[PDB]
Amino acid sequence: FLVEREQMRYPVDVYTGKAKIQVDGELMLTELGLEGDEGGPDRALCHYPREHYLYWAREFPEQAELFVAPAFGENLSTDGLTESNVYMGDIFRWGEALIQVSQPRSPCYKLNYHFDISDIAQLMQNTGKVGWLYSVIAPGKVSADAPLELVSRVSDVTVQEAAAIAWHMPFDDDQYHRLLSAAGLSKSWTRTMQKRRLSGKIEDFSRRLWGKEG
Description:
Elements: E1 9-10, E2 13-17, E3 20-22, E4 26-30, E5 33-34, E6 45-47, H1 52-59, E7 76-77, E8 91-94, E9 97-104, H2 109-115, H3 120-127, E10 132-138, E11 140-143, E12 148-152, H4 159-167, H5 173-181, H6 187-199, H7 206-210
Antiparallel strand pairs: 1-12, 2-3, 2-7, 4-5, 4-11, 6-10, 8-9, 8-12, 9-10
């Protein structure tokens, strides 16, 4: 863990909903999320990498204009952070608040309704370009002018592997045991990996990904 000492700092665009509109000054980050916005604690903030938009536009040239932040619902938009360099448990200082990565975002069939593309959820899930959520470790003033500083790297499980373990690999107790060991793991994901260990099976994903057609 030398990255803690590198003082990594990433500028971020901020958005809140009434849906999501860009915020420009300073607002309060409370335990439940951004003031004026809307496993509550574990999902108070959403993140989606801007890089991913190039991939969707190149994939769906015809509806390229739908693919711009914050089309995926995210609160935070950055360059330079993705599923392969963000780790489960990472704690970041933002202005005066402390936030911790708690799980990858799970793609939902509602996404398909929103882009009017019938298999975007399945595609998000298959590519692993899903973003992630934070739980707020300490509330406080934050701002669109204040960058995200990495301050603690406490696990060796990346968002990418956490997503592969949940959705890309065949049943494996060891991996489920490894995922349960990552600090900051949200309650619902703890519940889901624990249930697979006990049941001996992988819970269905059709309803989440396809709605009534699942």
